[PDB]
Amino acid sequence: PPGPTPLPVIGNILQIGIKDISKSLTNLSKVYGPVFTLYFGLKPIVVLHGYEAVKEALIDLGEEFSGRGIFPLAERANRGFGIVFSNGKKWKEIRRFSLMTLRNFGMGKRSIEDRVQEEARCLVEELRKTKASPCDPTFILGCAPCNVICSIIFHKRFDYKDQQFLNLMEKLNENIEILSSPWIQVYNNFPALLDYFPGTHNKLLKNVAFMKSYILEKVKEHQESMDMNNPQDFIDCFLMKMEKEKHNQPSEFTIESLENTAVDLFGAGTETTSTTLRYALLLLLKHPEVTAKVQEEIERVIGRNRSPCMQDRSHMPYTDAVVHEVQRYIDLLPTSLPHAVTCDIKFRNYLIPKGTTILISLTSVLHDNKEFPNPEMFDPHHFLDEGGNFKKSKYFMPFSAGKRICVGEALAGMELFLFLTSILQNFNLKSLVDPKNLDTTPVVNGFASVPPFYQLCFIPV
Numbered sequence: 001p002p003g004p005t006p007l008p009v010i011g012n013i014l015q016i017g018i019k020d021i022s023k024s025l026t027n028l029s030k031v032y033g034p035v036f037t038l039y040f041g042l043k044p045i046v047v048l049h050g051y052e053a054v055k056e057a058l059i060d061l062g063e064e065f066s067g068r069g070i071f072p073l074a075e076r077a078n079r080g081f082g083i084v085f086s087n088g089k090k091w092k093e094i095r096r097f098s099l100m101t102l103r104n105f106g107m108g109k110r111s112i113e114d115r116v117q118e119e120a121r122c123l124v125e126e127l128r129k130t131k132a133s134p135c136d137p138t139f140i141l142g143c144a145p146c147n148v149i150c151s152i153i154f155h156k157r158f159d160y161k162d163q164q165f166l167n168l169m170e171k172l173n174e175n176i177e178i179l180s181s182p183w184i185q186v187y188n189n190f191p192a193l194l195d196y197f198p199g200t201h202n203k204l205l206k207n208v209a210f211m212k213s214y215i216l217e218k219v220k221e222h223q224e225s226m227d228m229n230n231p232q233d234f235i236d237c238f239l240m241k242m243e244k245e246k247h248n249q250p251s252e253f254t255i256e257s258l259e260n261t262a263v264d265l266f267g268a269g270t271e272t273t274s275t276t277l278r279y280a281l282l283l284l285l286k287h288p289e290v291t292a293k294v295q296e297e298i299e300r301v302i303g304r305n306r307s308p309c310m311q312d313r314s315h316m317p318y319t320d321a322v323v324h325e326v327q328r329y330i331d332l333l334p335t336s337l338p339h340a341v342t343c344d345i346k347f348r349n350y351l352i353p354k355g356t357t358i359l360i361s362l363t364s365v366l367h368d369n370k371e372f373p374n375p376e377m378f379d380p381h382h383f384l385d386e387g388g389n390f391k392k393s394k395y396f397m398p399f400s401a402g403k404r405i406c407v408g409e410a411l412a413g414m415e416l417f418l419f420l421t422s423i424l425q426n427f428n429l430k431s432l433v434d435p436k437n438l439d440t441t442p443v444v445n446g447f448a449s450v451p452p453f454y455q456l457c458f459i460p461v
């Protein structure tokens with residue numbers, strides 16, 4: 001498994017960096033091929049680059065590449081396994097369960113779509129409160145996704161002002177700010193620095209503990225008020241799954257793992273959806289041509305009366321294309337989340353030892369040159385055939401693919417569509433600075449992409 005020969009202790013840091021480490025991977029693939037080795041300090045990593053190599057690993061050899069890889073910082077900042085950081089039987093079981101409860105009608109009488117439709121109405125309520133004045137959408141947009149998860153786990157969304165909510169929001173946001181500081185990377189290359197400067201990770205652990213104890217409060221309220229026969233949320237389902245397991249036992253389902261699975265969902269379900277929404281509005285501000293066509297579809301398919309629903313997406317190929325294009329263009333998780341091989345595998349004549357960390361280049365699939373002609377540009381036609389119909393692609397991998405594919409793929413797509421169509425149905429977007437002037441190019445800091453700062457006005461139609 002070829003790759004640049006590492007220096008004594010610093011590894012390949014001089015070539016990949018700490019900056020846009022995704023750009024370096026693409027450049028490195030031009031010289032070492034689709035399957036190459038990289039060193040983050042002493043740790044050996046295998047990077048998979050093209051669609052062919054990603055498909056082959058994630059799908060063809062799905063089981064073998066279903067392990068979750070964990071870097072030094074993440075390892076020290078995590079106490080307890082839920083779904084995101086889990087491996088083996090613990091992962092397999094908790095994930096299967098979560099996917100089951102996350103079905104549209106997998107948690108009682110009320111559907112996920114319904115909880116998302118209520119939030120969309122509320123999102124609009126809040127944007128109306130801005131009275132069409134210059135606004136930084138970062139906050140409002142972040143509240144909606146967090147609240148959807150709150151609704152799924154507690155059965156009750158919160159008013160955007162409830163203190164419980166703001167505390168939860170604050171911790172989630174604090175953790176992001178920390179994980180998004182460049183220098184975090186120094187820890188991944190030099191794990192010993194964790195012992196010397198523990199401030200970072202002690203803080204993440206603290207924040208997680210705050211959230212766990214807060215969720216514990218909730219599960220305790222749920223253990224009291226629980227009507228087995230009538231589950232209403234993720235907790236109710238978890239609690240009653242524990243009862244199905246009371247007789248088998250040692251068991252993967254515990255209050256501990258419930259707390260861990262709950263925070264994982266808040267963490268994995270908030271930030272990325274939030275950032276995508278913010279990035280979508282920026283792009284819509286930049287391309288009013290595009291926004292006008294999306295509004296044409298809204299006006300014709302959905303009234304201005306009723307609220308959007310998922311049934312409408314099929315009759316809204318342009319909007320669907322715009323949303324797909326937003327995710328494809330922004331490349332939020334350029335290297336997904338680290339994977340690890342489940343066993344000693346032979347891959348494309350290479351030989352990768354059990355436990356080896358695997359980095360999946362989502363960028364390289366999302367920005368494939370043949371599939372998406374001018375990949376670096378925002379163009380909804382990337383998902384439209386000659387007739388204005390939705391043109392799907394197997395290269396559309398923003399949620400990754402295979403056994404570890406985003407558990408919230410359905411939920412996220414539901415939020416993006418309903419929130420965005422709801423916003424554009426009730427408001428027109430006005431930029432203060434003017435379009436031709438603002439830049440939409442992603443800013444990257446470590447292993448996550450984000451948009452630049454901007455403001456806009458939500459003008460009622």
Ligand code: HEC
Pocket residue numbers: 068083084085095264265268269270272273276332333336337338339360398399400401403404405406407408409411412
């Ligand atoms: C349930 C709420 C939820 C929402 C909403 C959500 N995710 Fe996830 N996502 C998860 C969970 C849970 C995992 C962990 C999956 C695992 O480790 O098995 C995950 C994992 C991922 C991964 C890991 C891929 C890999 O190969 O392991 C990527 C990439 C990802 N999500 C992208 C996204 C994007 C992009 C969005 C939205 C724009 C999004 N997610 C929204 C829950 C969510």
Ligand SMILES: CC(=O)C[C@@H](c1ccccc1)c1c(O)c2ccccc2oc1=O
Pocket residue numbers: 068069070071072073074084085179184188335336337338447
């Ligand atoms: C936060 C970190 O120190 C590194 C981070 C990461 C993300 C993408 C590609 C490489 C490294 C990381 C995670 O976000 C992560 C998330 C869930 C489970 C395990 C993880 O391990 C990581 O290293």
